[PDB]
Amino acid sequence: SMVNSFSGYLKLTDNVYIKNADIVEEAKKVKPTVVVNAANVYLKHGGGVAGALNKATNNAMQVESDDYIATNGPLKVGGSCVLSGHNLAKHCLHVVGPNVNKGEDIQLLKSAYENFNQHEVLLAPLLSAGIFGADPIHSLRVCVDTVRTNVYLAVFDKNLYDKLVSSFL
Ligand SMILES: Nc1ncnc2c1ncn2[C@@H]1O[C@H](COP(=O)(O)OP(=O)(O)OC[C@H]2O[C@H](O)[C@H](O)[C@@H]2O)[C@@H](O)[C@H]1O
């Protein structure tokens, strides 16, 4: 197994680590095999993690995503696809958490995190915890209870990070 340069992560469990950092800056520094995007089913990378990752690729992520959708159609809620990581990572795993704010079942967050188990090591965000409206601590707990591979979580928001790391899992 390869060794990556992830540094400054707090250990949560045997396989889950967390840091107060911007996922774009972590990806630029570490250049991991897999960075995870918190996507929507259309791969329209507007804001949050998706918009920030896409901007850092100079829109190449969006161009590639548009071809993916034209060929294959939307992803499923809880689903994923593997695309290029462009200048940020070898690959980007686009994963769709439920849009809880629009009535999608929060239970699909477990299905979303199951996609991570197909990859030995990932740099990832907390799925559904932003504009999709899932409680962030719930997303973290589902991640810890679902993902068995090595996941390095980048939490942009300082106040959120401080709360998450002093919560039970
Ligand atoms: N640069 C960042 N680095 C790390 N974490 C971040 C960053 N930006 C936001 N977060 C945190 O990452 C977490 C997830 O926030 P979100 O990115 O909204 O993802 P979702 O799954 O809820 O919504 C998906 C939609 O978001 C996009 O618009 C897509 O195109 C989709 O339409 C929150 O805790 C954020 O504070």
Curated annotation (Swiss-Prot):
> Which branch of life, at top level?
Viruses
- Compartments reported by the entry: Host endoplasmic reticulum membrane
| Catalytic reactions of this protein | Thiol-dependent hydrolysis of ester, thioester, amide, peptide and isopeptide bonds formed by the C-terminal Gly of ubiquitin (a 76-residue protein attached to proteins as an intracellular targeting signal)
**Record entry for activity regulation:** Inhibited in vitro by GRL-0617.
Domain Macro: residue ranges: 3-169
Topological category with respect to the lipid bilayer: Multi-pass membrane protein
Q: What does this protein do?
A: Responsible for the cleavages located at the N-terminus of the replicase polyprotein. Participates together with nsp4 in the assembly of virally-induced cytoplasmic double-membrane vesicles necessary for viral replication. Antagonizes innate immune induction of type I interferon by blocking the phosphorylation, dimerization and subsequent nuclear translocation of host IRF3. Also prevents host NF-kappa-B signaling. In addition, PL-PRO possesses a deubiquitinating/deISGylating activity and processes both 'Lys-48'- and 'Lys-63'-linked polyubiquitin chains from cellular substrates.
Q: How does it assemble?
A: May form homohexamers. Interacts with N protein.
According to UniProt, the name of this protein is Papain-like protease nsp3
The scientific name of the source species is Severe acute respiratory syndrome coronavirus 2 (2019-nCoV)
Top-level taxonomy: Viruses, Riboviria, Orthornavirae, Pisuviricota, Pisoniviricetes
Q: Which residues of the complete protein does this chain represent?
A: 1025 to 1191 of 7096
